[PDB]
Design a protein around this ligand. Sequence first.
Ligand code: HEM
Ligand code: HEM
Ligand SMILES: Cc1nc(CO)c(-c2ccc(Oc3cccc(OC(F)(F)F)c3)cc2)c(O)c1Cl
Lengths: 74, 158, 370, 98, 57
Amino acid sequence: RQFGHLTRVRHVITYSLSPFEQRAFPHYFSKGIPNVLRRTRACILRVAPPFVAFYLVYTWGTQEFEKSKRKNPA
Amino acid sequence: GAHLSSPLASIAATNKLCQSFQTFNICYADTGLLGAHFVCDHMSIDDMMFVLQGQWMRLCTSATESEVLRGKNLLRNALVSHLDGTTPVCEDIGRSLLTYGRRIPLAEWESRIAEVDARVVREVCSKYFYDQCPAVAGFGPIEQLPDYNRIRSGMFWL
Amino acid sequence: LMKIVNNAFIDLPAPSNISSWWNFGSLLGICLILQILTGLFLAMHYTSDTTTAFSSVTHICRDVNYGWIIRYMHANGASMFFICLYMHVGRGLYYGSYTFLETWNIGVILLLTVMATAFMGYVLPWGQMSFWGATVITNLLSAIPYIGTNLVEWIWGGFSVDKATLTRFFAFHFILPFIIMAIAMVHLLFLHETGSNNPTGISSDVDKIPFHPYYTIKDILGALLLILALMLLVLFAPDLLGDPDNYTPANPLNTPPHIKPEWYFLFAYAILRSIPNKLGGVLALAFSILILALIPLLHTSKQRSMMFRPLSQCLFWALVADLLTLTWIGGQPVEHPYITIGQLASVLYFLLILVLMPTAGTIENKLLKW
Amino acid sequence: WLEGIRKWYYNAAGFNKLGLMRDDTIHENDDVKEAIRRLPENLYDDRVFRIKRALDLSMRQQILPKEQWTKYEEDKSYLEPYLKEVIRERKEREEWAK
Amino acid sequence: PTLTARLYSLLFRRTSTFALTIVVGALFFERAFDQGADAIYEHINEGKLWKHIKHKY
Ligand code: HEM
Ligand code: HEM
Ligand SMILES: Cc1nc(CO)c(-c2ccc(Oc3cccc(OC(F)(F)F)c3)cc2)c(O)c1Cl
């Protein structure tokens, strides 16, 4: 497979520029970092909470393990 | 057909890659446009462009003197045969007096041409083709038309 | 003229919307070559005999001119291998690539090839975990009825691991990556009939582009970070992942208190360790892997991706936790606080795959009327 | 109450933040390739451009502004007539074989 | 012209030169980078290395 018989396009226009005629990293700090946040807010809720719970079962799993080795009053 | 001289033609006749193409040279006040126009079936664009770019690099690098005298002798039979009548003349006048200033008597063009040898071409084409930042246009089934980067990477031999 | 096949690798159509995730799909081409390249020079000095092997390792780590590196570019390199996989395998789940049914199944046989290779690769130097790590894993096949004792004796060349069982691996182990090197080419061939599979899930045929300028350098950039995050281990912390015991010579009359194979089994080792029964836990293990072949018969949503399925996102990364749990829970000994977690987590693994990920699309189809 | 949830899920899936519609994102199979072949030009090219820009913005990880987003009431189900037409023929083609 | 443009038309234009440039710069670069790290490494570990205890014995 290759270019030439993939599929159909009609009445679409493309505007593209050389790289030499433009900076490589325009608005890297300005527009990116707000876009990092918006990128972040849209994933954080359904990514962490499992890993959040993991921090607790890595927490309680060791604490409850430590106690079991300490003697009892008997 | 195949027996033509310009390699770009004999190939396109041999392999039937295209249907028509022409070069040009447009010239404006302190700049111009140098390049070409070509028309071909969608399954053959990328092949033509490699050949075209192959020739420019060939001319900027290895311009055989025997191939120069052709184009010199071709050009003479343009300006002359162009000036077979009055209307072509009166264009060249009315266009000369706003572009160059003085009209140029044709024995002046001829002297300028005979200065041209294969050493000059390798300098000129180096200045205006090699590694430059071309401009590209497209209108049609161009599914095979390569990206701008691939065009420029194909601009310099080696 | 055969160069024209590298239309596949030069003028190939591929999308433009592509993340840096798919670099991981390419690094294995580097890791596979990088590992063999290292391991080859490495194995110019290894010896397939017991009495000299552990010395024949230290013959490298001490006396050879920069031979000490090659052990660790190889070893930890074998771990950066997996770190790409378990981001590369989790990918197609999260972007719906398993639909390429002819390809995903190949993605299994590469894995099982490795998880029986890398195993052989840990046991060569007789690190006192080599031996028992060879014993614990290999003995499980004895669980089978009427053939278990026969095969394991047959692969033990006798009755337990010994000089013969070393050498039966060093040849089985120095060969298979080539079988991976070949099957990898197959893994790309079935792809080339369809090309990649965007994050969206949509046929981006309208927006396919070349490969020589764009994804090449991106892959190099991907490769550059790999070497970086591989030089750090070897240069600054080679003792990190590999358990320390592997520098002790091996002795069948002395076990360590705690045993674990290398860290990467642990998502799967723990599953067996949860089940107190012997056999019935094994078939969970092999099913803990081959389940990936069972997924494409469980693609419910008439969408493909999970970028556009926020509910399944909540369940996908959830699975990553359970793995990151089972990766660790197996790494710790057998005591009451943890066993209660393995009985849950291992069930959660099978549960999230076979019940709820279908159930999401069964719903999400209905929230949007198809 | 239900319908307050469909409108919400459709906002959380993301694919209104990319100028897309619902039929755009469907898994492509033989059943669907039939329908996309059967569409008219005016609507077909209108499918293409919705995709062709969403890709370029899933490249950048950028989106459209809030105004140009898609709206649930405007989530036109342009494909459903052409699709269910097919699977009618499919099950007519199968049960006729039994 | 800037240094950059003066640098382009001399070296980075003709590919035959562009490869000649790199080995040259690399050949000298090997001579500096080693001296740098070997001294920084010496400096940070001052009073620890063999060459620092090479006179006593
Ligand atoms: C995916 C392929 C492979 C994996 C996963 C793998 C696994 C391993 C591992 C984990 C070690 C750790 C030993 C240590 O750190 O001390 C090792 C060592 C070794 N590898 Fe492999 N290996 C692979 C392929 C190879 C190849 C391709 C070669 C040779 C070309 C090779 C030859 C050796 C030898 C001789 C040793 C002993 C050195 C040692 O134990 O440190 N292996 N291998
Ligand atoms: C040495 C082992 C492997 C090599 C060399 C390899 C190589 C590749 C490469 C180069 C790609 C294209 C890059 C990409 O699509 O992201 C790819 C894609 C893929 N690989 Fe791997 N792979 C290996 C192991 C695996 C494994 C273990 C799986 C497990 C399922 C797998 C499943 C896939 C799938 C499903 C794709 C689909 C591509 C797409 O969705 O566009 N591969 N593989
Ligand atoms: C989309 C996409 N497609 C392809 C191939 O279709 C590739 C791709 C490109 C080149 C490839 O060639 C290689 C390079 C090094 C090792 C390698 O292993 C080997 F050789 F099979 F062992 C294959 C292999 C895969 C890719 O990196 C991406 Cl991102």
